[PDB]
Design an enzyme around this catalytic site. Structure first.
Site, short mmCIF file in Angstrom:
data_model
loop_
_atom_site.label_atom_id
_atom_site.label_comp_id
_atom_site.label_asym_id
_atom_site.label_seq_id
_atom_site.Cartn_x
_atom_site.Cartn_y
_atom_site.Cartn_z
N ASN A 162 44.67 52.47 57.84
CA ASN A 162 44.35 51.10 58.22
C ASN A 162 45.09 50.16 57.28
O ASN A 162 44.64 49.95 56.14
CB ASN A 162 42.83 50.89 58.15
N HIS A 217 43.49 47.32 66.87
CA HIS A 217 43.43 47.54 65.44
C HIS A 217 42.53 48.73 65.10
O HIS A 217 41.32 48.68 65.40
CB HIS A 217 42.89 46.27 64.75
N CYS A 266 41.29 41.95 58.60
CA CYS A 266 41.92 42.89 59.50
C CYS A 266 42.24 42.37 60.89
O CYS A 266 43.01 43.05 61.57
CB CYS A 266 41.05 44.13 59.70
N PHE A 306 41.81 52.40 53.99
CA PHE A 306 42.87 51.41 53.85
C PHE A 306 44.13 51.90 53.13
O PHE A 306 44.12 52.57 52.09
CB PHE A 306 42.30 50.19 53.12
C1 COA Z 1 34.12 56.34 58.40
C2 COA Z 1 34.32 57.22 59.65
C3 COA Z 1 35.80 57.60 59.79
C4 COA Z 1 33.51 58.54 59.60
O1 COA Z 1 33.62 59.20 60.85
P1 COA Z 1 32.32 59.48 61.54
O2 COA Z 1 32.66 60.07 62.88
O3 COA Z 1 31.57 58.26 61.79
O4 COA Z 1 31.52 60.61 60.77
P2 COA Z 1 30.08 61.03 60.24
O5 COA Z 1 29.01 60.46 61.12
O6 COA Z 1 29.93 62.53 60.17
O7 COA Z 1 29.98 60.43 58.77
C5 COA Z 1 31.14 60.07 57.92
C6 COA Z 1 30.69 59.25 56.68
O8 COA Z 1 30.78 57.78 57.06
C7 COA Z 1 29.82 57.04 56.24
N1 COA Z 1 29.91 55.67 56.62
C8 COA Z 1 30.66 55.06 57.60
N2 COA Z 1 30.51 53.72 57.67
C9 COA Z 1 29.59 53.46 56.65
C10 COA Z 1 28.82 52.30 56.42
N3 COA Z 1 28.73 51.30 57.34
N4 COA Z 1 27.82 52.46 55.49
C11 COA Z 1 27.54 53.68 54.95
N5 COA Z 1 28.17 54.81 55.12
C12 COA Z 1 29.20 54.62 56.01
C13 COA Z 1 28.66 57.86 55.93
O9 COA Z 1 27.69 56.96 56.30
C14 COA Z 1 29.10 59.22 56.51
O10 COA Z 1 28.82 60.30 55.48
P3 COA Z 1 27.53 61.20 55.81
O11 COA Z 1 26.95 60.86 57.14
O12 COA Z 1 27.91 62.62 55.81
O13 COA Z 1 26.62 60.75 54.56
C15 COA Z 1 33.80 56.40 60.86
O14 COA Z 1 32.44 55.99 60.57
C16 COA Z 1 34.54 55.05 61.03
O15 COA Z 1 35.66 55.01 61.59
N6 COA Z 1 33.81 53.99 60.64
C17 COA Z 1 34.66 52.70 60.68
C18 COA Z 1 33.76 51.50 60.86
C19 COA Z 1 34.42 50.24 60.37
O16 COA Z 1 33.59 49.41 60.01
N7 COA Z 1 35.71 50.04 60.14
C20 COA Z 1 35.96 48.56 59.78
C21 COA Z 1 36.83 48.37 58.52
S1 COA Z 1 36.90 46.63 58.16
#
Ligand code: COA
Ligand code: COA
Lengths: 388, 388
Positions: free
Chosen positions: A335, A302, A163, A214
């Site tokens: 993404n 990004h 990414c 993605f």
């Molecule tokens: C996924 C995302 C949109 C969810 O939004 P959020 O504000 O964080 O929301 P919440 O805290 O309520 O949880 C959303 C779900 O994300 C999950 N999640 C996000 N990243 C995860 C990871 N590292 N491992 C496990 N679960 C993951 C759950 O953990 C969670 O579900 P739950 O808490 O109800 O079981 C947000 O975590 C995000 O943008 N993470 C991106 C991180 C990233 O690594 N992107 C890189 C891609 S290469």
């Protein structure tokens, strides 16, 4: 013979400049609101009730409204292997993406070349970047053939990059254009999720996060130094670049290409790592230029997920509007890995021109573009806008 | 702020220069004379009597005396999948090469850095090139970690490139070094045949040719512009580069990365294509420099097999000695894909210095390096030697 004289005559004189941007996406538009239902159904996972509930919270928080996907219901029904969390399926996935990555990249490239307006025989260098699939000859050869570029175009085939590589291709194009008089670089990022799509598993929740975020897309640029006044039309100038590996981030974003396709892992807090390290990146880039107000520059980040954007905005006290162009691309396309940042540059210059601002950089002079991805790697590109 | 002033201050002034070369190979040295016996035995193919006879003629004509191989009898006995002509085996192959490519590349890099003599903290750019395996973060990240380079080294991860890419990395390093003041580029090509090894099949004789020719190895360079007088020691200068696709060569060298590993195909007469197109490559490179006697320059040619070398020598009426350094590397190491041409530069400058010639280029001033591989692609690098 004088090598000094050859060197002086060989090189360009001004900063590498983006002279055109074109984008493309698969025709299949997949709504995010109902994606958990679609996805748990197509992967035969409706019995996993709490996992599906988790996925719907991930998709609802993703701040993505829709994504474009090569994969369709029909293709997925013909490839149950791909719909499993972990089944032998790389040959089928490769067969999809070795064709779709150059097909999609061609569409974006034709639009960039049309906007540029010059003969494609004047393209001297071609950079192709993808994280989906590999082949020999690569997607660079295929796009040379599909576009009818000159056979002696100088090619840079960037595979399995991840990414951050929208920043990488800019960092690369900058040196190609600046060190070679007359060089015109076609840049193509083309990303297709058919190698990473897989069913859900409740002991691999990080994998599930990728399924929520993605999407597919390609972006093409023309980059060159010394633009020909009023024939070519500068959009952004590149001035400085950096790449670094964040401390305490080993294993934060990992992907392995296996018999089951491309896997995806997150073993660290990526939004926190990015937000803890972004200030150092900004002072390396901007303290030499005398700027320390990060609301005074235009922003491209990004959008690996919205949490990265939210935590950077919070860390730096960015005004909510700084991330507008970035969030608009996340919302309408998800993404798109390496291509995403290039879609955001297009969004930014199109809105800035459409709305009568003074520069392509939201009316500001200096800007920054960041790629984030495996390493954890941060790419930084310092940009200058162009008047009108 | 003046971008013109930044650009002028940012760039280097002289030609990109090779300042150090180091190489490495797996410890397992496999004799060519007896390889058909070993190979037909380890792949359980002793009943295929005429095919084995064919293979012995291929190996006897290969002009290879030995190759270094990561793969050993013991590893092969643990991986029957790999010993089959076509069995699911990419996961096992990846597990080998995601570790061995950076391990081997580290050994070569440590030797190049020792020869260079400067702090590794002065390495600003890292190019890593391999055709064996892919991973995220890539071999570039792994070598950054293994060597303790600065985390902000600028990385170029070149995957699935194929046999021309020793020229590609030089073409890339040239622009990185020349466009960036003080830049010092570590270049690493590391090639390991565990992804392409497979058993024999009598309807896939082109696959068999690869089994006769490819061997393992890594080479590392330090490349920089503006060498510091009598601290750094120039070996070769780069002056001009090109890449082209030969006409009438579609499908001449193809490789697909599949669940069964990396396949290899030859669907056209590669020695004939190379020899029909090499003159055009030489006149593009050398007519601007006023040279048309191709025995008056020093030669490095990727030894994809001896027939390429023989037919180029015949086409151009090269004296048999022109190809000496190239043939010595083929003989002692086989076709090491992208790394091979860099081993030949090391051979050439070491023999030229050991034997008291006037320049590192066999006592001649100008030279040429060619990579040949999928496309069919020809890479050209015009070199100048250094006195003593
Ligand atoms: C996924 C995302 C949109 C969810 O939004 P959020 O504000 O964080 O929301 P919440 O805290 O309520 O949880 C959303 C779900 O994300 C999950 N999640 C996000 N990243 C995860 C990871 N590292 N491992 C496990 N679960 C993951 C759950 O953990 C969670 O579900 P739950 O808490 O109800 O079981 C947000 O975590 C995000 O943008 N993470 C991106 C991180 C990233 O690594 N992107 C890189 C891609 S290469
Ligand atoms: C393989 C090689 C060393 C054999 O030397 P040679 O002088 O050509 O010898 P011969 O004509 O007596 O034949 C050697 C064996 O090569 C085979 N061979 C070589 N290339 C092959 C291909 N394209 N398809 C099928 N067989 C191939 C046989 O065809 C032949 O066995 P046979 O004629 O007894 O059945 C020589 O062909 C070579 O260097 N070819 C390299 C071409 C190349 O593509 N290298 C690129 C690697 S990416």
């Amino acid at each position: 013979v004088s090598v000094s004289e050859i060197r002086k005559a060989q090189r360009a004189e001004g900063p590498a400049t983006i002279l055109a941007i074109g984008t493309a996406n698969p025709a299949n538009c997949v709504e995010q609101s109902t994606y958990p239902d679609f996805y748990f159904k197509i992967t035969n996972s409706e019995h996993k009730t709490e996992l599906k509930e988790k996925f719907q919270r991930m998709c609802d928080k993703s701040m993505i409204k829709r994504r474009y996907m090569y994969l369709t219901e029909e293709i997925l029904k013909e490839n149950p292997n791909v719909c499993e969390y972990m089944a032998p399926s790389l040959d089928a996935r490769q067969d999809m993406v070795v064709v779709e990555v150059p097909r999609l990249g061609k569409e974006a490239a034709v639009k960039a070349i049309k906007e540029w307006g010059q003969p494609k025989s004047k393209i001297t260098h071609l950079i192709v970047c993808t994280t989906s699939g590999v082949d020999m000859p690569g997607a660079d050869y295929q796009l040379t053939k599909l576009l009818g570029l000159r056979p002696y175009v100088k090619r840079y085939m960037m595979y399995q990059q991840g990414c951050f590589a929208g920043g990488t291709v800019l960092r690369l194009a900058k040196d190609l254009a600046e060190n070679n008089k007359g060089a015109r670089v076609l840049v193509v990022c083309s990303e297709v999720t058919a190698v990473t799509f897989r069913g859900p598993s409740d002991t691999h929740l990080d994998s599930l996060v990728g399924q929520a975020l993605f999407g597919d897309g390609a972006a093409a640029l023309i980059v060159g130094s010394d633009p020909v006044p009023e024939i070519e039309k500068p959009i952004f100038e590149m001035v400085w670049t950096a790449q670094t590996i964040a401390p305490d981030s080993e294993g934060a974003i990992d992907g392995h290409l296996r018999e089951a396709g491309l896997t995806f892992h997150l073993l660290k807090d990526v939004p926190g790592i990015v937000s803890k390290n972004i200030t150092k990146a900004l002072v390396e880039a901007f303290e030499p230029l005398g700027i320390s107000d990060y609301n005074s520059i235009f922003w491209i980040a990004h959008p690996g997920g919205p949490a990265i954007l939210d935590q950077v905005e919070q860390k730096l006290a960015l005004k909510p509007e700084k991330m507008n162009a970035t969030r608009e691309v996340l919302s309408e396309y998800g993404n798109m890995s390496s291509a995403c940042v290039l879609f955001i540059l297009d969004e930014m210059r199109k809105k800035s021109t459409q709305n009568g601002l003074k520069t392509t950089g939201e009316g500001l002079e200096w800007g920054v573009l960041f790629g984030f991805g495996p390493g954890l790697t941060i790419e930084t590109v310092v940009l200058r806008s162009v008047a009108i």
